[PDB]
Design a protein around this nucleic acid. Structure first.
Ligand SMILES: CON(C)Cc1ccc(O)c2c1C[C@H]1C[C@H]3[C@H](N(C)C)C(O)=C(C(N)=O)C(=O)[C@@]3(O)C(O)=C1C2=O
Ligand SMILES: [Mg+2]
Ligand SMILES: [Mg+2]
Ligand SMILES: [Mg+2]
Ligand SMILES: [Mg+2]
Ligand SMILES: [Mg+2]
Ligand SMILES: [Mg+2]
Ligand SMILES: [Mg+2]
Ligand SMILES: [Mg+2]
Ligand SMILES: [Mg+2]
Ligand SMILES: [Mg+2]
Ligand SMILES: [Mg+2]
Ligand SMILES: [Mg+2]
Ligand SMILES: [Mg+2]
Ligand SMILES: [Mg+2]
Ligand SMILES: [Mg+2]
Ligand SMILES: [Mg+2]
Ligand SMILES: [Mg+2]
Ligand SMILES: [Mg+2]
Ligand SMILES: [Mg+2]
Ligand SMILES: [Mg+2]
Ligand SMILES: [Mg+2]
Ligand SMILES: [Mg+2]
Ligand SMILES: [Mg+2]
Ligand SMILES: [Mg+2]
Ligand SMILES: [Mg+2]
Ligand SMILES: [Mg+2]
Ligand SMILES: [Mg+2]
Ligand SMILES: [Mg+2]
Ligand SMILES: [Mg+2]
Ligand SMILES: [Mg+2]
Ligand SMILES: [Mg+2]
Ligand SMILES: [Mg+2]
Ligand SMILES: [Mg+2]
Ligand SMILES: [Mg+2]
Ligand SMILES: [Mg+2]
Ligand SMILES: [Mg+2]
Ligand SMILES: [Zn+2]
Ligand SMILES: [Zn+2]
Lengths: 144, 50, 60, 67
RNA sequence: UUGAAGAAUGAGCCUGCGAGUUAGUGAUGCGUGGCGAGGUUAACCCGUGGUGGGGGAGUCGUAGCGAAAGCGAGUCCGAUA
RNA sequence: UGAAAUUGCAUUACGAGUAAAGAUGCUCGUUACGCGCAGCAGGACGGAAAGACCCCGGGACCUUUACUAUAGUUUGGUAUU
């Protein structure tokens, strides 16, 4: 039984639009720009530094290259594996880590910051050495 | 022009390890020095490149 | 002339490109030659490009 | 329309995991003979920008994460 | 404008008109609302009945470090320093 | 019969001062009843033209053994041969 005339926004949700150049009791006349100069009329570009050689020219170019065929490993940690499979996840898989969170349709590398008190069989794409060591120490395994 | 830049390369692994300056008129010939060669991992004789 | 009466080869337009790369408009005309032809039985001149003349597409 | 990122900024500046802006030290490309090994060591690192310069670089990168 | 009642500028007078706008699934803050380790759809399809429903392709968050191979709570320079 | 440029205003003195350094308008004094008509040009830094000199920014055109180009003229190759 609200009725359309009882709908009001939350306080502070609709800030009033500041209207500039409408009198000297507000941002009036110069409209918050001061007097004379470039800034009195347009702007100054962010790459411009006054004629001094700008930072983006004086700094040397980071060289190197990009791997055209670089693949990025979605990474899951042993903390997360333990938390999302606490009941001793017998055989975790890519689909299971995806329904938890791994951002699927990618390679699903597992890393090893954590403890992993449970036994787990990961079956993922690649793993770190410390993660593998912790997994067999707990009694689990990795595959693929 | 009278004190050129000379490059010392190790006489073992022919690696241009160092660069320095001589006098050309006070030392006309190629200079011999014992410097540390990182590749050879010891002190090897270094000779000015030709 | 710069248009072939056979194959209608016509000038192309591009750039003079100096060392400083100050590009200026220029033209590439086809190598048009005016030769005597005997077509069917008609003696007449025709402006014929050297490509057509070499290919033999023109009867002399 | 989408805002393009500054090309020189893309090629020259990195953004770390914690939002720091870093560049490569300047002055080591050539004329290195007269420079001591100490000077070359000072110039061979990676410098962290000041707050104002980092803000300017972040504005120049149109959300580009740096090189 | 350092400084103007100024013998510096503009206005004869009234009435009307006359300048911070709008567009981006732009960039970056803040307020506020929703959901929350998740958030969100674009085109398009359906609703000839709209403002509603579908659509998760993508995209941001979910790990960083390195020129990169790569390694990974570490990584890179380095001598497994 | 009937305009014009001009016009922040008005109940618009002088003297010696003072002040953006040359005041009808501020100070201290002096003089002056209200309103007209014909006149004269010392002042209102009088009106008319966003100084035409100077400098600073921009432009234009002109010049040349400034730069970079180019039509034209010329050299050779090659096609037509
Ligand atoms: C001998 O030195 N005395 C003091 C000057 C002077 C004397 C007698 C004159 O007769 C004129 C001048 C000045 C010039 C100024 C010229 C100028 N122009 C050439 C760019 C200009 O700017 C305008 C204008 N319309 O603004 C002109 O009137 C103008 O052309 C012209 O005619 C002038 C004259 O008549
Ligand atoms: Mg004001
Ligand atoms: Mg005003
Ligand atoms: Mg302001
Ligand atoms: Mg202003
Ligand atoms: Mg102004
Ligand atoms: Mg100023
Ligand atoms: Mg200003
Ligand atoms: Mg600014
Ligand atoms: Mg721009
Ligand atoms: Mg300069
Ligand atoms: Mg052009
Ligand atoms: Mg031939
Ligand atoms: Mg180099
Ligand atoms: Mg050195
Ligand atoms: Mg002044
Ligand atoms: Mg005035
Ligand atoms: Mg006055
Ligand atoms: Mg003025
Ligand atoms: Mg006026
Ligand atoms: Mg007006
Ligand atoms: Mg997807
Ligand atoms: Mg005075
Ligand atoms: Mg006086
Ligand atoms: Mg007085
Ligand atoms: Mg008074
Ligand atoms: Mg009179
Ligand atoms: Mg009179
Ligand atoms: Mg007078
Ligand atoms: Mg005047
Ligand atoms: Mg002027
Ligand atoms: Mg004039
Ligand atoms: Mg004049
Ligand atoms: Mg000019
Ligand atoms: Mg003119
Ligand atoms: Mg010729
Ligand atoms: Mg010839
Ligand atoms: Zn050596
Ligand atoms: Zn032809």
């Amino acid at each position: 039984a609200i009725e359309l005339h009882d709908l009001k926004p939350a306080p502070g949700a609709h800030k009033a639009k500041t209207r500039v150049g409408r009198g000297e009791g507000s941002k009036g006349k110069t409209a918050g720009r001061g007097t004379k100069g470039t800034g009195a009329r347009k702007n100054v570009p962010e790459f411009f530094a006054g004629g001094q050689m700008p930072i983006h020219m004086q700094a040397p170019k980071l060289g190197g290259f990009h791997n055209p065929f670089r693949t990025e490993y979605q990474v899951v940690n042993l903390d997360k594996v333990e938390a999302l499979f606490p009941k001793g996840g017998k055989i975790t898989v890519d689909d299971l880590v995806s329904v938890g969170a791994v951002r699927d349709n990618e390679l699903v590398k597992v890393l090893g910051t954590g403890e992993l008190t449970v036994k787990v069989d990961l079956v993922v794409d690649a793993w770190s050495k410390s993660a593998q060591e912790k997994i067999e120490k707990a009694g689990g395994s990795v595959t693929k | 022009d009278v004190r050129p830049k000379i490059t010392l390369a190790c006489t073992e692994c022919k690696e241009r390890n160092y660069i320095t300056k001589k006098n050309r008129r006070n030392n006309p010939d190629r200079m011999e020095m014992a410097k540390f060669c990182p590749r050879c991992r010891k002190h090897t004789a270094h000779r000015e490149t030709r | 002339a710069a248009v072939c009466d056979i194959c209608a080869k016509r000038p192309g337009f591009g750039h003079n490109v100096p060392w400083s790369k100050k590009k200026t408009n220029r033209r590439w005309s086809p190598n048009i030659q005016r030769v005597r032809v005997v077509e069917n039985g008609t003696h007449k001149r025709m402006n014929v490009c050297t490509s057509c003349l070499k290919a033999g597409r023109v009867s002399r | 329309p989408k805002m393009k990122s500054h090309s020189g900024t893309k090629k020259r500046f990195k953004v770390t995991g914690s939002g720091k802006v870093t560049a490569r030290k300047a002055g080591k490309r050539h004329l290195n003979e007269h420079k001591s090994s100490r000077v070359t060591r000072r110039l061979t690192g990676e410098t962290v920008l000041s707050k104002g310069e980092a803000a300017k670089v972040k504005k120049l990168l149109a959300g580009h994460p740096g090189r």
